[PDB]
Structure 1
Amino acid sequence: AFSVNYDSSFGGYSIHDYLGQWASTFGDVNHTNGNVTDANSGGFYGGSLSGSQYAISSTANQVTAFVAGGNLTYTLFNEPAHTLYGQLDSLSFGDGLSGGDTSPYSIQVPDVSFGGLNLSSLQAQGHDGVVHQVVYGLMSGDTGALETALNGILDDYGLSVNSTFDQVAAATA
């Protein structure tokens, strides 16, 4: 049922009066096209994050970056906490990062990229999942988990991470 709680000093105020005073001090956040940042976006509680891509740029130089493509969700503060899981199809490495809103993320000056990775992990595996280990590894500048996963795939072609890009392109054609 509809209910109202209030500090007792507002007992004799009308609802209209109160909301007029609240709005007066609040002002206008100007949540409009071209004007939305973290200062006026507001925020959500209780939710997870999802998307066909996750991307991040270096804080050391703000240029070096990677883009993970697939079907990913991140539990954020839901349990198991701070777990990335789902399907990791692709990984692009290079300099500069554009898009991410009404267009996909893209590396501006691409070096190298991998497609058809076919890596997946369940929510319940938590931080032990391969997708989480790979992507979080890369956020921390640690390629070890990625290289272990790539060695697993490349094993089918008699290759490894010590193979060159030309060798890998030759066997996977």
Structure 2
Amino acid sequence: MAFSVNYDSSFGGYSIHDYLGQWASTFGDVNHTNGNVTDANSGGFYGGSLSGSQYAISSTANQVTAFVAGGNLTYTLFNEPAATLYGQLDSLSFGDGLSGGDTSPYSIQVPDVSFGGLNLSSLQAQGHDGVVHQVVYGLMSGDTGALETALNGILDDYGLSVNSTFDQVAAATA
């Protein structure tokens, strides 16, 4: 599992960039900035108040659209590097309807699209500009830039990019 995709068949013909743009447009922007944080726009880990096996959040614009990152995600709320998600990211899953996350895993009710085998490490020395911090925080802000750049990294070894279809990426993994 040095990479894999799964997807609702409706997206076979979407480029990765096109699905992510659709996803970001309706997810919106959680607005995780100063003066504006809440219970509502923070997310949560599965397996701890602050560290865990997956981090997940729902859109505060439509209550529904969501993602879940999953690998080995420690955080540092007030710790040495102030407010910076570090660790290990293996998977991103996008879609509608986040449930669970307490004594069960975070699970998406209506999955769209899912990447596994990302192999992306940032250690807590690298702060609020590590890499998993930049991806995840990016996603929390409706900004897929950081995820699309990393994906092109993974995908260009297969002679593809995020501007190729899901069916196409599927073919190149087997």
The TM-score range, normalised by the shorter chain, is 0.7 to 0.9
Structure 1 stretch displaced more, 37-46 or 113-122: 37-46
Answer whether contact 2:66 2:98 (CA < 8 A) is retained: yes
Answer whether contact 2:152 2:160 (CA < 8 A) is retained: yes
Answer whether contact 2:8 2:112 (CA < 8 A) is retained: no
Look up the match of 2:155: 154
CA distance in 1, matches of 2:18, 2:140: 51
> Which digits, 9 at most, give the CA deviation of each residue in 1:25-84, with x for residues without a partner?
999999999999989999999998210010000000000000000001110011101110
Q: Kindly state the Cα deviation for residue 159 of structure 1 after the two structures are TM-superposed.
A: 0.4
In terms of fraction of residues, the more helix-rich structure is 1
Answer whether contact 2:44 2:101 (CA < 8 A) is retained: no
Structure 2 vs 1, CA of residues 158 and 34 (structure 1 numbering), >3 Å: closer, same or farther?
A: closer
Answer whether contact 2:13 2:166 (CA < 8 A) is retained: no
Structure 2 vs 1, CA of residues 2 and 38 (structure 1 numbering), >3 Å: closer, same or farther?
A: same
> Which digits, 9 at most, give the CA deviation of each residue in 1:121-151, with x for residues without a partner?
0101001111000000000000000000000
Identity among equivalent positions (%) equals: 99
Answer whether contact 1:80 1:126 (CA < 8 A) is retained: yes
Q: Kindly state the Cα deviation for residue 118 of structure 1 after the two structures are TM-superposed.
A: 0.4
Structure 2 vs 1, CA of residues 120 and 57 (structure 1 numbering), >3 Å: closer, same or farther?
A: same
Q: May I ask how many residue pairs the two structures share in their alignment?
A: 173
Task: List structure 1 runs of 4+ shifted beyond 3 angstroms.
Answer: 1-48
Structure 2 vs 1, CA of residues 78 and 166 (structure 1 numbering), >3 Å: closer, same or farther?
A: same
* TM-score w.r.t. length of structure 2: 0.72
What secondary structure is seen at the aligned counterpart in 2 of 1:79?
A: coil
* 1:105 and 2:106 are equivalent in the alignment: yes
- Structure 1 residue runs of 5 or longer lacking an equivalent are none
Structure 1 stretch displaced more, 31-40 or 158-167: 31-40
Structure 2 vs 1, CA of residues 50 and 163 (structure 1 numbering), >3 Å: closer, same or farther?
A: same
Answer whether contact 2:55 2:68 (CA < 8 A) is retained: yes
Answer whether contact 1:119 1:131 (CA < 8 A) is retained: yes
* TM-score w.r.t. length of structure 1: 0.73
Answer whether contact 1:47 1:78 (CA < 8 A) is retained: no
- Structure 2 residue runs of 5 or longer lacking an equivalent are none
> Which digits, 9 at most, give the CA deviation of each residue in 1:86-110, with x for residues without a partner?
1100000000001101110011100
Structure 2 vs 1, CA of residues 5 and 30 (structure 1 numbering), >3 Å: closer, same or farther?
A: same
